[PDB]
Amino acid sequence: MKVISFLNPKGGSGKTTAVINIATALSRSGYNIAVVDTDPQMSLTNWSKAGKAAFDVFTAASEKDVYGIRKDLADYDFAIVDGAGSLSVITSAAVMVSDLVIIPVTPSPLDFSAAGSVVTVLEAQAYSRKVEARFLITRKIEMATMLNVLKESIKDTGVKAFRTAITQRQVYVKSILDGDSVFESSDGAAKGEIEILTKEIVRIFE
């Protein structure tokens, strides 16, 4: 089993949106997926109350639930962790049990510092214990042609970003409100980037 966490204390960085759609993409590909919500607000948990998730959902009530992830979800192929809104104990717990940490970050030059705070935690571990990490660019508006500012900031951390960025689309907002994913919509563009993005994630473990 492999553990993937989507971490960034910054609210609205796209963690939950990414988790739902990527978890769905993985399930569609034949993987056995479990998603663990560690957010006190339980956005993902509530979303799953509609009962339309193509994967199993779990709600971490404390850091202890995150520690036992490798034992409790050993039967799954991937356990995907949806992050919280602060660099608390629950966040550190997520880092420690992860095989891969994905840092959703938008092109906002003012909000990059939040994503960088997660890198600081990751960079604290020894090389022999270093967790694999990637930036995932999210909420990128369609008219964006070249994000050199974001590129420089990312380059400065040393952590690589996925090639595929999650674009800003209302379908991402509507689907979650209906308790579904983009794979239940008619937006073929949204489904496309999520599919290619997922392939990149998989390739990391293959």
Ligand X SMILES: Nc1ncnc2c1ncn2[C@@H]1O[C@H](COP(=O)(O)OP(=O)(O)O)[C@@H](O)[C@H]1O
- Residue among 13 and 45 whose Cβ is closer to ligand X: 13
Residue 16 binding ligand X, by CB under 6 A: yes
Q: Give CA separation, 196 vs 23, 34, 71, 190, in Å.
A: 13, 21, 30, 10
Is 14 annotated as belonging to a binding site? yes
Report yes or no: 19 and 82 within 8 Å, Cβ to Cβ.
yes
Which residue type does 190 have? A
Report yes or no: 8 and 105 within 8 Å, Cβ to Cβ.
yes
Round to whole Å and give the CA distance between 53 and 160: 30
Round to whole Å and give the CA distance between 82 and 25: 16
Count of residues interacting with ligand X (CB under 6 A)? 15
Residue 117 binding ligand X, by CB under 6 A: no
Residue 8 binding Mg ion, by CB under 5 A: no
CB atoms within 10 A of CB 203: 8
138 binds, among ligand X, Mg ion, none (CB under 5 to 8 A by kind): ligand X
Compose the 10-29 pattern: x for residues touching Mg ion by CB under 5 A, - for all others: -----xx-------------
Q: How far is the CB of 105 from ligand X (least distance, A)?
A: 10
Residue 166 binding ligand X, by CB under 6 A: yes
User: Where do contacts with ligand X occur on this chain (CB under 6 A)?
Assistant: 11-17, 43, 138-139, 166, 168-169, 172-173
Detail the residues annotated as belonging to a binding site.
12-17, 82, 139, 167, 169
